[PDB]
């Protein structure tokens, strides 16, 4: 446990609440990729099966349950409650090009050939590309609302802080996980265009055009 990990967990929970409250208060999920929310829910489901085999801490258990709860709730608001404002015509990313290959790669490239480890690996590879449908939707529609960009900033910053956390844990604890690291780098580089546009445009009162 270090400040980079804690700030990364707070940044991830901030992003999840920003999106959930934006949809709930506005009674609309316009411009939100439902597909990326299905992918994030699927990451939490496959990663957190260890809730049944391990107890690390009350913080670890609580955060996992909150993430599963908010990811499933976000999916429910998009596809059931406010489905009248879900823009299916613009959320056209073919997620089978992500799930089928990521699934195949988790079975072949992992730390152990056992069901719980293969499922954890799937969650790591899938998370690295889970935001692709949302970024693809923004480029298609042309615009991204300010609150949508704050959601994307805090979501992108979370795994960037986890990379710093892995440098810290490697130096001080001798801990190293190459699958999480390489996937974490892939996950963060996919935000590079967004980060540049958020800092130079959004933080200066301008339009984010992907």
């Amino acid at each position: 446990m270090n400040i980079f990990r804690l700030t990364g967990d707070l940044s991830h929970l901030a992003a999840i609440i920003i999106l959930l409250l934006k949809i709930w208060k506005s009674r609309s999920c316009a411009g939100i990729s439902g597909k990326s929310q299905l992918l994030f829910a699927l990451v939490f489901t496959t990663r957190y099966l260890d809730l049944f085999t391990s107890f690390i801490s009350l913080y670890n258990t609580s955060m996992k349950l909150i993430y599963i709860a908010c990811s499933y709730a976000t999916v429910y608001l998009i596809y059931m409650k406010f489905k009248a404002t879900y823009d299916g015509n613009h959320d056209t990313f073919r997620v089978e090009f992500l799930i089928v290959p990521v699934g195949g790669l988790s079975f072949l490239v992992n730390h152990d050939f056992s069901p719980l480890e293969i499922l954890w690996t799937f969650s790591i590879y899938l998370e690295s590309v889970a935001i692709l449908p949302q970024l693809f939707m923004i480029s298609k529609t042309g615009e991204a609302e300010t609150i949508t960009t704050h959601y994307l900033f805090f979501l992108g910053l979370y795994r960037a802080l986890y990379l710093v956390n892995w440098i810290w844990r490697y130096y001080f604890e001798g801990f190293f996980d190459l699958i999480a690291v390489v996937a974490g780098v892939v996950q963060t580089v996919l935000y590079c265009d967004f980060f540049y546009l958020y800092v130079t445009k959004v933080l200066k009162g301008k339009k984010l055009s992907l």
């Binding site: 260890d50 670890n60 996980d177």
Partner: peptide, 6 residues
């Protein structure tokens, strides 16, 4: 290997 992060 044990997974201690989110």
């Amino acid at each position: 290997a044990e997974h201690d992060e989110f």
